[PDB]
Design a protein around this ligand. Structure first.
Ligand code: HEM
Ligand SMILES: Oc1c(Cl)cc(Cl)cc1Cl
Length: 137
């Protein structure tokens, strides 16, 4: 289930973080509008850029903590209030996070592993709602 998936993702987190984030940027090319430094790069080039690997892993490091602290895929309100009070996220809509989770769920559905993709879809929805309730546009 969801909890085991957290463990699975953590056991190879740098790879999963990069592959899922690339799936997001490739499915939603306009999202590079928030990632000016990644334009005109293939997946293999992005994987060569220090901040790409370091930032994607940090994002997923914190996403897994928020998943771990959730109950029945519902994150703590403190964790959402922390995501909202992020200066790096000042120019972000809930829609950006929604798209990242659509890509994450589709990645899990396409893998041969028994990820609980429906739980991740609920988690992404519930995190968006919690971000909106904590003040994200
Ligand atoms: C649960 C989902 C997410 C979490 C936990 C998260 C967390 C983080 C973290 C830890 C950083 C710092 C990275 C660094 O500077 O080393 C960051 C920065 C940044 N993030 Fe996110 N982020 C999430 C989703 C998103 C999404 C969906 C977008 C845009 C589509 C985004 C856009 C940015 C930008 C532009 C910066 C700078 N983030 N975020
Ligand atoms: O470089 C970044 C990456 Cl790869 C992902 C996110 Cl969500 C934010 C930043 Cl600044």
């Amino acid at each position: 289930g969801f909890k085991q998936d957290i463990a699975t993702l953590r056991g190879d987190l740098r790879t999963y973080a990069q592959d899922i984030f690339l799936a997001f940027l490739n499915k939603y090319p306009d999202e590079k509008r928030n990632f000016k430094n990644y334009v005109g790069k293939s997946d293999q080039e992005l994987k060569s850029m220090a901040k790409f690997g370091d930032h994607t892993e940090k994002v997923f490091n914190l996403m897994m903590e928020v998943a771990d602290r959730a109950t029945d895929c519902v994150p703590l309100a403190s964790d959402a209030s922390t995501l909202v009070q992020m200066k790096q996220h000042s120019g972000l809509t809930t829609g950006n996070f929604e798209k990242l989770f659509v890509a994450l769920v589709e990645y899990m559905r396409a893998s041969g592993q028994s990820f609980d993709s429906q739980s991740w879809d609920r988690f992404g929805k519930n995190l968006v709602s919690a971000l909106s309730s904590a003040g994200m546009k």
